[PDB]
Design a protein around this nucleic acid. Structure first.
Ligand SMILES: [Ca+2]
Ligand SMILES: [Mg+2]
Ligand SMILES: [Mg+2]
Length: 432
DNA sequence: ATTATGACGCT
DNA sequence: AGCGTCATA
């Protein structure tokens, strides 16, 4: 009744760049624009591994993780851009720098949480209050929402044959129902949130050339889900009211954090398929199976309610460099291990020095991780040491010292079992 | 032989 | 601390 919170206190958006690495390459090379395009890394093994795919290429069935030689079988005219290689390894600087361009624009509108290289959550609650005061009871025109979908609409009762017409019919029903006379209507707040996101998205495109999609809702999980409902180059508003129908057929794995083993457990243990089916369990029941924290989270989430705050953090918390040495390329000599630790340390030194200059901070811990031939785990071993100076030779020497005792080989010069992954990561930043 | 990342939870 | 999970291009 009157005491049951509804998770409608905030307006949160999730902005996600469309096929991000591809757009970065298309901006740089106009010949790639409006074409089936993919970004690949390395080239010698099966034409390289695809890591980003334009919407034109996806129509042919090209996906991430596909080998470019295989993608070419589906899409013979596929164009490719290759990730830059430096010091013998893929170097993602160009995309990191493009990400900064976008993140800096978003930060003009509101506080953001950098969630990945190409997406950020936005807390719009304050911005919405401000805009509502400016509007002074003024209705919101559909003209202010030119790329917005309202999830769940239109409903009930011939232009609806095409997608743009459906989008507009839905928007009109939504706005027709809105009560603009009340500065505290959650639905109104979401709508104004959407007006602001249109503006943010226009600014991103104007100032970078990059297009993005976005979700607008009352929390991060619904915002993220919403964003994916209409891509590319569109934004989606998911209201509290839309949740029961949306979740009624929504596979559990689609919700963020339930895409892996926990999500699988939920389905297996409870014998359900859809997020909405969770409402029939008590909070205690969910806690008994999935733990106190997850059980409480699931109980609220299946009702559209989540409280995780948009953290004020625009910069990454760690800076790392990693390389796999698959199959026959695994490092089997000490000279090999040392040469590559050095290559990695040199890239890391370069990124750290630039980070210190731009952002007034210094990393204080170096984390060293390796994988050994045979183990099916990301990392086999992880060891930290102190990071006291931005010097590549020192860092690589320290990394070797910390891992040297993993070498089974009774021989000094040989390395066994061979190493199939090296990883250096600078962490634990402090102001400088 | 997807690879190169990056955040956060557990004990 | 070191390990595991989940997620990004
Ligand atoms: Ca994206
Ligand atoms: Mg993304
Ligand atoms: Mg993606």
């Amino acid at each position: 009744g009157p005491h049951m919170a509804t998770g409608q206190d905030r307006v949160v958006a999730l902005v996600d760049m469309d096929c991000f690495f591809v757009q970065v390459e298309q901006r740089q090379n106009p010949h790639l624009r409006n074409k089936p395009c993919a970004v690949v890394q390395y080239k010698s093994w099966k034409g390289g591994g695809i890591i980003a795919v334009s919407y034109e290429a996806r129509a042919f069935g090209v996906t991430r993780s596909m080998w470019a030689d295989d993608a070419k079988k589906l899409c013979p005219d596929l164009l490719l851009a290759q990730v830059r290689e430096s010091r013998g390894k893929a170097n993602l600087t160009k995309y990191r720098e493009a990400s900064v361009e976008v993140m800096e624009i978003m930060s003009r509108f509101a506080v953001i949480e950098r969630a990945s290289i190409d997406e950020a959550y936005v807390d719009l609650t304050s911005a919405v209050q401000e805009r509502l005061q400016k509007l002074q009871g003024q209705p919101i025109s559909a003209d202010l929402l030119p790329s917005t979908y309202i999830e769940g609409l239109p409903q009930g009762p011939e232009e609806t044959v095409q997608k743009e017409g459906m989008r507009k019919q839905g928007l009109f029903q939504w706005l027709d129902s809105l009560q603009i006379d009340n500065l505290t209507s959650p639905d109104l707040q979401l709508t104004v949130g959407a007006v602001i996101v249109e503006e943010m998205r226009a600014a991103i495109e104007r100032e970078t050339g990059f297009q993005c999609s976005a979700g607008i809702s009352h929390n991060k999980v619904l915002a993220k889900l919403a964003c994916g409902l209409n891509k590319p180059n569109r934004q989606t508003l998911v209201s509290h009211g839309s949740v029961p129908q949306l979740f009624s057929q929504m596979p559990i794995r689609k919700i963020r954090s339930l895409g892996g083993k926990l999500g699988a457990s939920v389905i297996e243990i409870l014998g359900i398929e859809y997020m909405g089916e969770l409402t029939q369990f008590t909070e205690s029941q969910l806690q008994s199976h999935f733990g106190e924290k997850n059980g409480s989270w699931l109980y609220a989430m299946c009702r559209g309610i989540e409280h995780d705050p948009v953290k004020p953090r625009q910069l990454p918390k760690t800076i790392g460099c990693s390389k796999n040495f698959p199959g026959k390329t695994a490092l089997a000599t000490r000279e090999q291990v040392q040469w590559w630790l050095l290559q990695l340390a040199q890239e890391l030194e370069e990124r750290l020095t630039k980070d210190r200059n731009d952002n007034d901070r210094v990393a204080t811990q170096l984390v060293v991780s390796i994988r050994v031939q045979g183990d099916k785990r990301l990392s086999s071993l992880r060891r930290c040491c102190a990071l006291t100076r931005y010097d590549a030779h020192k860092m690589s020497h320290d990394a070797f010292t910390v891992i040297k005792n993993c070498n089974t080989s009774g021989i000094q010069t040989e390395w066994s079992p061979p190493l199939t992954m090296l990883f250096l990561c600078a962490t634990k930043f402090s102001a400088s």
